[PDB]
Amino acid sequence: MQIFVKTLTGKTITLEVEPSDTIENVKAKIQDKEGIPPDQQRLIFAGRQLEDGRTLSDYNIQKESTLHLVLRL
Amino acid sequence: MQIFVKTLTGKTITLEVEPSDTIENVKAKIQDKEGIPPDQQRLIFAGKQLEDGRTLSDYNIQKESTLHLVLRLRG
């Protein structure tokens, strides 16, 4: 399925993911598109930070859900 | 130098490491003590997951720092 990620400039990118993808897998997909290493990425959904070991479906992330990318400072 | 690792039960072990040790090397040292293969280990420090190709030095991990071992499980 497709999900969206709001990037550091507020532009939206589109990823192909599965409900069983872990957040660590999703951060690797974001690294491919944005060039930010996973250990520098905070991923936010519904106003909370996601943990690396959970799946997208563990957070009830759906088709065409939007995640937010934040850079670790 | 000495660092600590909190294991899957919350017990702490000690590792002998150098600041130049990679995280992949540290996972191999954890395998020797805990019997968990490196590809099944998530190593956490300061609330974030460490990447294999970085050194302890790259995360400013110092003597007596405590890392957290988590088992790779979806969920």
Side-chain angles (χ1 to χ4, degrees):
Chain A
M1 61 185 190
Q2 294 179 322
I3 66 169
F4 306 118
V5 180
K6 191 197 182 210
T7 70
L8 296 190
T9 59
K11 165 170 152 267
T12 300
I13 64 166
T14 307
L15 305 183
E16 183 70 29
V17 298
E18 289 299 334
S20 59
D21 285 351
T22 60
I23 296 306
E24 66 188 5
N25 185 2
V26 173
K27 289 181 173 172
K29 294 179 178 185
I30 291 171
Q31 176 181 43
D32 289 345
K33 294 199 178 298
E34 299 304 304
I36 300 161
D39 65 359
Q40 308 299 318
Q41 298 179 32
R42 290 193 184 96
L43 209 46
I44 319 293
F45 181 63
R48 66 142 164 203
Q49 183 177 6
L50 308 184
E51 296 189 22
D52 280 356
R54 306 245 196 265
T55 69
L56 291 174
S57 288
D58 289 336
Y59 287 118
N60 205 30
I61 294 165
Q62 317 260 309
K63 173 187 172 171
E64 293 167 351
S65 288
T66 301
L67 308 188
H68 293 80
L69 172 67
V70 178
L71 183 65
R72 281 211 168 75
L73 303 181
Chain B
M1 72 183 183
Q2 167 174 99
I3 66 170
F4 303 106
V5 179
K6 296 226 157 186
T7 71
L8 298 186
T9 63
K11 156 173 134 278
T12 43
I13 62 165
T14 294
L15 301 180
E16 182 66 30
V17 299
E18 294 298 335
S20 57
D21 287 353
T22 62
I23 296 308
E24 64 186 6
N25 186 3
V26 174
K27 289 180 172 170
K29 290 176 174 189
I30 292 171
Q31 176 183 40
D32 285 347
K33 295 234 179 167
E34 299 302 303
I36 302 158
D39 65 358
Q40 296 250 106
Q41 298 180 28
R42 299 195 178 102
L43 201 50
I44 317 299
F45 181 68
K48 65 164 194 175
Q49 184 178 184
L50 309 184
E51 298 190 19
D52 281 0
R54 300 225 199 280
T55 65
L56 293 174
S57 73
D58 288 332
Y59 289 116
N60 206 15
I61 291 164
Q62 288 154 36
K63 63 181 178 53
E64 297 168 18
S65 291
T66 304
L67 306 187
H68 295 78
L69 173 66
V70 173
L71 190 60
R72 271 216 166 74
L73 319 152
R74 280 192 175 91

